[PDB]
Amino acid sequence: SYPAIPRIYAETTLNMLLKRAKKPRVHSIDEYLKDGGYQALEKALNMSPEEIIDWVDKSTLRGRGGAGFPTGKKWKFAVQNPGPRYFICNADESEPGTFKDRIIIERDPHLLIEGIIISSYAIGANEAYIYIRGEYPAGYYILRDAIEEAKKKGFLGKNILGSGFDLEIYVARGAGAYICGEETALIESLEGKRGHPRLKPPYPVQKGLWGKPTVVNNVETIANVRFIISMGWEEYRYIGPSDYAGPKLFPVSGKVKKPGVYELPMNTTLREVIFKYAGGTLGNKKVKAVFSGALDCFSSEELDIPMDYSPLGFGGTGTVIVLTEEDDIVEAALKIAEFYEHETCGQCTPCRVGCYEQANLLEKIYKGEATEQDWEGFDFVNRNIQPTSICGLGAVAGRLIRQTLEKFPEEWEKYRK
Amino acid sequence: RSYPAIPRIYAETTLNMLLKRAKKPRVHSIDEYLKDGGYQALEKALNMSPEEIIDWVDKSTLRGRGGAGFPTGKKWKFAVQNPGPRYFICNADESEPGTFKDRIIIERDPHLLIEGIIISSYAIGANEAYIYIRGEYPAGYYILRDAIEEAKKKGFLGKNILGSGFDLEIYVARGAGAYICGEETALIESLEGKRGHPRLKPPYPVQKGLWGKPTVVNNVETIANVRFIISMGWEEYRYIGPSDYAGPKLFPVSGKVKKPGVYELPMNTTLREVIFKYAGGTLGNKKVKAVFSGALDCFSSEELDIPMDYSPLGFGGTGTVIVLTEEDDIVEAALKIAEFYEHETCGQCTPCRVGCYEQANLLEKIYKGEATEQDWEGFDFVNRNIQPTSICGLGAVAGRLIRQTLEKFPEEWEKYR
Amino acid sequence: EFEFPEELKTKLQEHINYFPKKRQAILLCLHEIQNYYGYIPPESLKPLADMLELPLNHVEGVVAFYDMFDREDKAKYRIRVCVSIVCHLMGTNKLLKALENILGIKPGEVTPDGKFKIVPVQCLGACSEAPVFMVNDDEYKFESEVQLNEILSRYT
Amino acid sequence: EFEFPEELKTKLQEHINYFPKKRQAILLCLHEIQNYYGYIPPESLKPLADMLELPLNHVEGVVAFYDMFDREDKAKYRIRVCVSIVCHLMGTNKLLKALENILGIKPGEVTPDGKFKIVPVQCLGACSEAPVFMVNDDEYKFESEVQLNEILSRYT
Numbered sequence A: 001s002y003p004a005i006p007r008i009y010a011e012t013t014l015n016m017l018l019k020r021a022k023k024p025r026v027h028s029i030d031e032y033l034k035d036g037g038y039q040a041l042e043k044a045l046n047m048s049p050e051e052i053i054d055w056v057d058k059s060t061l062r063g064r065g066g067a068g069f070p071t072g073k074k075w076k077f078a079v080q081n082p083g084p085r086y087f088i089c090n091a092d093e094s095e096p097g098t099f100k101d102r103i104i105i106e107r108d109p110h111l112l113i114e115g116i117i118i119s120s121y122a123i124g125a126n127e128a129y130i131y132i133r134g135e136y137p138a139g140y141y142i143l144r145d146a147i148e149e150a151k152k153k154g155f156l157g158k159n160i161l162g163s164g165f166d167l168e169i170y171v172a173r174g175a176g177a178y179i180c181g182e183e184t185a186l187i188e189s190l191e192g193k194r195g196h197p198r199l200k201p202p203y204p205v206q207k208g209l210w211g212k213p214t215v216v217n218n219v220e221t222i223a224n225v226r227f228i229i230s231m232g233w234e235e236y237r238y239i240g241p242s243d244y245a246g247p248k249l250f251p252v253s254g255k256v257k258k259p260g261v262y263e264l265p266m267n268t269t270l271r272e273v274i275f276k277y278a279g280g281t282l283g284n285k286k287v288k289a290v291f292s293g294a295l296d297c298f299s300s301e302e303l304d305i306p307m308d309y310s311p312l313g314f315g316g317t318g319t320v321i322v323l324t325e326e327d328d329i330v331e332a333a334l335k336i337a338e339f340y341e342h343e344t345c346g347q348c349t350p351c352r353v354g355c356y357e358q359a360n361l362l363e364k365i366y367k368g369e370a371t372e373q374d375w376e377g378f379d380f381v382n383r384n385i386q387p388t389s390i391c392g393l394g395a396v397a398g399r400l401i402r403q404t405l406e407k408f409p410e411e412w413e414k415y416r417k
Numbered sequence B: 001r002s003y004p005a006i007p008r009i010y011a012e013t014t015l016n017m018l019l020k021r022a023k024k025p026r027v028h029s030i031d032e033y034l035k036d037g038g039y040q041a042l043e044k045a046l047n048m049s050p051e052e053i054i055d056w057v058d059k060s061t062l063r064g065r066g067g068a069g070f071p072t073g074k075k076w077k078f079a080v081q082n083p084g085p086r087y088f089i090c091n092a093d094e095s096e097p098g099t100f101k102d103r104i105i106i107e108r109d110p111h112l113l114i115e116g117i118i119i120s121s122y123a124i125g126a127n128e129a130y131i132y133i134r135g136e137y138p139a140g141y142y143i144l145r146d147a148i149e150e151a152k153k154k155g156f157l158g159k160n161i162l163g164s165g166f167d168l169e170i171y172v173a174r175g176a177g178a179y180i181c182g183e184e185t186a187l188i189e190s191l192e193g194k195r196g197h198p199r200l201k202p203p204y205p206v207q208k209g210l211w212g213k214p215t216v217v218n219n220v221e222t223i224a225n226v227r228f229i230i231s232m233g234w235e236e237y238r239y240i241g242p243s244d245y246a247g248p249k250l251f252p253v254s255g256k257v258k259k260p261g262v263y264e265l266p267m268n269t270t271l272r273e274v275i276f277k278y279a280g281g282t283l284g285n286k287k288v289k290a291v292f293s294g295a296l297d298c299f300s301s302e303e304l305d306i307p308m309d310y311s312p313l314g315f316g317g318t319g320t321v322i323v324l325t326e327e328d329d330i331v332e333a334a335l336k337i338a339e340f341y342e343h344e345t346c347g348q349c350t351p352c353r354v355g356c357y358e359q360a361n362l363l364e365k366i367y368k369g370e371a372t373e374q375d376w377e378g379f380d381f382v383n384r385n386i387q388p389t390s391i392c393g394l395g396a397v398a399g400r401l402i403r404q405t406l407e408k409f410p411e412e413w414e415k416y417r
Numbered sequence C, D: 001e002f003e004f005p006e007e008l009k010t011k012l013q014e015h016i017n018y019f020p021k022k023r024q025a026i027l028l029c030l031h032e033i034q035n036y037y038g039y040i041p042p043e044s045l046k047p048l049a050d051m052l053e054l055p056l057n058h059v060e061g062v063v064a065f066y067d068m069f070d071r072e073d074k075a076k077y078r079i080r081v082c083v084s085i086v087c088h089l090m091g092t093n094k095l096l097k098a099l100e101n102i103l104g105i106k107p108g109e110v111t112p113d114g115k116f117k118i119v120p121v122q123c124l125g126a127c128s129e130a131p132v133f134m135v136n137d138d139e140y141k142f143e144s145e146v147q148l149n150e151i152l153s154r155y156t
């Protein structure tokens, strides 16, 4: 018995990450084994760590946490440095509009766990961690139980299936800080401290948990490892376009008829996501904007871009928040400002002060109480959150809002007039 | 999305239960249904034992709406006294002349029915359920299919529904022209892929049914009540209308009234009130000559003050009211009824097979003025000798209405002789 | 010889896969066949029986029993006219007259172009909207000839 | 004189023993304490500190930082209402209006009986089911007041 979870709609054209998680329920180990679960692990333990790294490299799998760093190269970087090494699954998923990782956690834990074990073995880590946000309590208990199940079927513990490889997966809980999704702050939290990002360099692959080589990979990244081993890198790359191959999860919300998670190839266009898959818009209103989480803002001019990692592609995490023609852009921007205000950890002064002032001033604008100086101030702080910032939050806390200013001037101008 | 054209049957309720949404002539999809507390009775049901649900439905006093008035909870009790697997079947064959009350649940408020099916199936330990819907309701069929998909998406169907450990799949089957497939044993024969031939009873479906296993067949309207029993509790439900015939009843009114349509009323309403207070009186303010209770009973203008309940002096049947006014030829009407039974006898029993044909063929001769004196005496005799050796109720009732027109309108028949 | 075009065969196989037992899918398969061909081709029955793992006489008997199925006349649109009590009381005869005036056929007949067949049927469960008729899956109240002509103009 | 009752002390020790190093169990411990009492007592921190082999101010620093922890208001049931972008578009304010109508409180406030506290939170990662709320660990989409009133009747 687990806490109540809303039944998010899930749909797939590729039937990989959502083969089971398209069904809104906990798939336990037996049902997992039935479809050939844990056989990729078995195959992996009969391979060298170097070869697994090679396959993940050649698959062109890239991180799904937002920074988009090649996974195999990441792993290769860590194994250049003496052990012991640690593997961390990043399940903090707290950016507005993003709910894709949780459906893997809640419906198909063993897809995740199988990935962690292969990955850990690939980098020689005997200690792995899932860091899951505190507001995902059902995910927490589902993971713990699925870990117990894996242990009893002999997939975890010492000398896993006679291989000589030992592994324990510990499940840690967050407690309300979006910044703890930043990998260095994640590691700080795991070491029992506040979620304060560390200055880079050094980089975790060199110096992370207890100063030791540490690979942090997103849940959805890890969800792909089973498949790369199972089908081989060459069959894997045949999925979608040669350039950006592989399955990808798109959490679609806002003013669409069918909000939910969609598993699609990355040659899909943003327009297709909205109109082909998510049923179009509510009331068939015209799309005004798409928020790529709390990162970017695309106009209705920019729908025909691919959902990939090309220069001109959507990028980000595939998070699609749809706003239609009656949605007030300033109102929406304020909500973004508020998020950043609540999530700056405050160690960098321009970020600390910017996030605060951007929200406070924008709220005055919104309420029609801004002075002429408040307006110029707002403009100014929005351009000056980033300086001296030691992590990406401060780099992007102004980004989306700046884009709305540049793409919807007429609607802002009305607030100024 | 897009469904076949359905006439917009008028609906009106003084109780606002079965016809709460279905008073509005359109499809009510899951979101609207949830907004009105949809599927919350299912949630409460799954936190009770099946035994309690059976108990509540028993104490509700709910009696079958399909025509035979068998107490619904008791029916469930009998089934669960036999070992599983068990099956649940929603009878949506509704093919009796004058009866269109079930279709408006199906087409307008499908989730009310689906909710009821799930609770009922859980009550009897059935993991497989069917809706058997007549082939001449294509819109209903596509609406039900779509609604089931919506239910799966929100996790009300499938495996381990809402963490309860209860599994259910609902399959939708379509009839293909045959009124007899509404008789429960013949329905079951059809579901097995055979002709609709009723089986000899005993044994009864609750003991030996679909694939010889314990089977509960319930009428659409019956199942539409289950939501209200769990939601309100059996005591409050029992308080609707007269205590001996409690709960909402649907009443399809047709023929020579101002407001033909389906009325949701308590069962202490009189036939007279149905016609004049609710259905707007008669066309042209003509005098009522008769009310056909579908193709089952014929009531004179002297019999309008009876209750629309299941008492011995009440209306009975399915509450189907077809109103005939002073200029309607009763013999012409009797012919149409004889023709119905002619077309619908399955033929297994000789007196039914031959009687249904002869009653119609001879009465056609009477109506057309071409009957010999022997034809008159024949018709009288065949009318009294359809029932002998009958396996099912069709042959028992094929002459009933017609006999009543001969007793209650002798002067009109004498004009034909 | 006779085989199902794959487009039809796929839908057929879906129905067969839909219920737990293949033979349950017989009525759905037959609806599908009558939708594809505008009728049930006699030749179509042996290969259906194969797919259902049923004897042919079983499926023949089933086709014979259920009145919606037609093995004799190909029609693009089946005009199902209710001939039971309520529709009779409220004007079935006026509907068929209007049908004859417009199409030039009576119950049981097909138009020369194969387009329309009048099928007299029992109560369609819409008696408050009598007199009632269906055009394939679409269902309507008959009001008048002119109104009827406009509905039929929608079927091309 | 503040001491954790045995049942709690036991659960805390489980967490401290779960990770390789004791200090890694601080957030699990703090979730436990808040679950047990309905807030984080200030008196709990010193003894927690001793079990983790950490100084008190480290522990206090941690409580101040992590938004799920509350040292001020005891509540049986925390109603976490999402106030971020997607829930806002889809009807956070209707959710709050309905909460006020039922419970008589606004965000920040605790019922007199101390049974329900409304906690405004950032995106809960269920945006397709906006507007989203939790009641302790349970999570739900808000549909309407009547639907909400029924959900809340489950917490006694």
Ligand SMILES: Cc1cc2nc3c(=O)[nH]c(=O)nc-3n(C[C@H](O)[C@H](O)[C@H](O)COP(=O)(O)O)c2cc1C
Residues within 6 Å of the ligand: A062, A063, A064, A065, A066, A067, A068, A069, A090, A091, A092, A093, A094, A095, A178, A179, A180, A181, A182, A183, A184, A216, A217, A218, A219, A221, A391, A392, A393
């Ligand atoms: C403010 C901030 C929040 C982040 N939140 C997450 C998160 O919730 N989940 C995640 O996997 N990565 C998150 N990241 C990215 C991580 O720092 C890191 O790039 C990622 O977890 C590595 O996994 P990947 O290489 O497989 O993408 C965040 C980064 C920043 C700057």
Ligand SMILES: Cc1cc2nc3c(=O)[nH]c(=O)nc-3n(C[C@H](O)[C@H](O)[C@H](O)COP(=O)(O)O)c2cc1C
Residues within 6 Å of the ligand: B063, B064, B065, B066, B067, B068, B069, B070, B091, B092, B093, B094, B095, B096, B179, B180, B181, B182, B183, B184, B185, B217, B218, B219, B220, B222, B223, B392, B393, B394
């Ligand atoms: C000829 C004949 C036709 C019937 N048609 C129907 C029908 O269309 N729908 C129905 O629910 N019951 C019909 N019945 C009654 C069923 O056999 C059975 O009593 C009923 O479906 C049980 O459900 P209930 O207890 O909820 O009424 C028919 C019975 C006979 C004899």
Ligand code: SF4
Residues within 6 Å of the ligand: A179, A196, A197, A343, A344, A345, A346, A347, A348, A349, A351, A352, A389, A390, A391, A392, A393, A394, A395
């Ligand atoms: S940029 Fe902002 S969030 Fe990142 S470390 Fe600095 S103050 Fe903290």
Ligand code: SF4
Residues within 6 Å of the ligand: B180, B197, B198, B344, B345, B346, B347, B348, B349, B350, B352, B353, B390, B391, B392, B393, B394, B395, B396
């Ligand atoms: S009574 Fe008539 S309809 Fe019923 S089984 Fe016998 S022949 Fe068939």
Ligand code: FES
Residues within 6 Å of the ligand: B097, B098, B099, C082, C083, C084, C085, C086, C087, C088, C122, C123, C124, C125, C126, C127, C130, C132
């Ligand atoms: S009598 Fe014609 S539809 Fe009922």
Ligand code: FES
Residues within 6 Å of the ligand: A096, A097, A098, D082, D083, D084, D085, D086, D087, D088, D122, D123, D124, D125, D126, D127, D130, D132
């Ligand atoms: S915006 Fe509310 S759950 Fe994401």
Ligand SMILES: [Cl-]
Residues within 6 Å of the ligand: A067, A182, A183, A392
């Ligand atoms: Cl990062």
Ligand SMILES: [Cl-]
Residues within 6 Å of the ligand: B068, B183, B184, B393
């Ligand atoms: Cl019966």
Ligand SMILES: [Cl-]
Residues within 6 Å of the ligand: D054, D055, D056, D057
């Ligand atoms: Cl100290």
Ligand code: NA
Residues within 6 Å of the ligand: A005, A006, A007, A008, A102, A103, A106, A107
């Ligand atoms: Na989920």
Ligand code: NA
Residues within 6 Å of the ligand: A092, A094, A132, A133, A134, A174, A175, A176, A177, A178, A179, A180, A181
């Ligand atoms: Na967190």
Ligand code: NA
Residues within 6 Å of the ligand: A182, A183, A184, A200
């Ligand atoms: Na980083």
Ligand code: NA
Residues within 6 Å of the ligand: A338, A359, A363
């Ligand atoms: Na604000």
Ligand code: NA
Residues within 6 Å of the ligand: B093, B095, B133, B134, B135, B175, B176, B177, B178, B179, B181, B182
């Ligand atoms: Na039928």
Ligand code: NA
Residues within 6 Å of the ligand: B177, B178, B179, B343, C067, C121, C122
């Ligand atoms: Na018929």
Ligand code: NA
Residues within 6 Å of the ligand: B242, B244, B245, B268, B307, B309
């Ligand atoms: Na009474």
